[PDB]
Amino acid sequence: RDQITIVGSSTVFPYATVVAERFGKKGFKTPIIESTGTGGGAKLFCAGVGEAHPDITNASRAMKDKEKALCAKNGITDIVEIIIGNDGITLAYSLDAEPVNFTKEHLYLALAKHTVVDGKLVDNIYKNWNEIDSSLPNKPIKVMIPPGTSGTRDAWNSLVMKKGMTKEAKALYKAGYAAGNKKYKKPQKLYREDGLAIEVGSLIIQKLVEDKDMFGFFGFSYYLAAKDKLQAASIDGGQPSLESIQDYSYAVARPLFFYVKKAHVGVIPGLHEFVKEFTKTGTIGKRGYLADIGLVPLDKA
């Protein structure tokens, strides 16, 4: 094989694509890149050490212990982690609607599998944002959530669900878990399944345009490209921006990664050279060509 193979995060995908396109003009073939999702990419990367398996998986959250364990089992223990920059998960919606600010708790309450009612966990009873907080708009809850195995789902679970989770809910889940419910050990993973938090799967933008009350998830680069049609909800009083993502004042700032199968260096031509190209200051630094399309570079202060 003489072409580099890259799988993984859809958040990282547009960035790795630009690097690949430039790379293809420097005496190597243009790498092959698939947008498979962080978790789907990790599974593929970790399937085996042979050339039939991907050289690189992109990730919008760190590799998980379960994933490292699979890799190890299939003989991949030499993995290089590269942090390319940052993302801000953006909760976008149609420009035709009013600006809005949701706290992390607001978001948790709307999306959660359960509402605490009379000291008991029951299926989510919130149908309108204004029920959760009278300061929120009278607007039905309609959210398109990322895929279950996506890194964006994982990061939202960690940064929003876990943190927005109420003390009261936490205690009920902990007690249910202690009493034997294994699914309640990590309750931040649990979303309502009554159609108000529908799993997603270009057309997200279209669906948001079609229903101004609907909200959706976007990696920052995708939101920026769509600003002619979409705006961002404030989260904890803050909008996503280069500055707020870079200093992590933005509440859903997050790092972006890719992982390199070291064994394939020296087997697949250009693999190391591609990594060095991606890691150049002119690529991922301030004013680099990835910053020009929305990558928030690592703060170097």
- CA dist 279 → 58, 130, 282, 300 (Å): 14, 46, 8, 14
Tracing tokens 């999306």 back to the chain, one arrives at: 111
Q: Computed from CA positions of residues 86, 91, 92, 97, in that sequence, does the dihedral angle turn out positive or negative?
A: negative
For residues 179 and 50, the answer to whether their CB atoms sit within 8 Å is: no
Resolution value (Å, 1 decimal): 2.0
What residues pair up with 299 in beta bridges, in sequence order? none
Domain ranges of the chain: 5-86+255-293, 90-239
Superfamily of 5-86+255-293 according to CATH: Periplasmic binding protein-like II (3.40.190.10)
Question: Do residues 295 and 221 make contact, with C-beta atoms less than 8 angstroms apart?
Answer: yes
Q: What is the DSSP letter of 152?
A: H
List C-alpha distances in Å: 266 to 1, 82, 90, 272.
12, 19, 39, 8
Pairing of strands 215-218, 143-145: parallel
5-86+255-293 and 90-239 have identical folds: yes
* Measured distance CA(10)–CA(78) in Å, rounded: 24
**Determination technique for this PDB entry?**
X-ray
Give the single-character DSSP code of 184: G
CA distance 2 to 82: 22
CATH code assigned to 90-239: 3.40.190.10
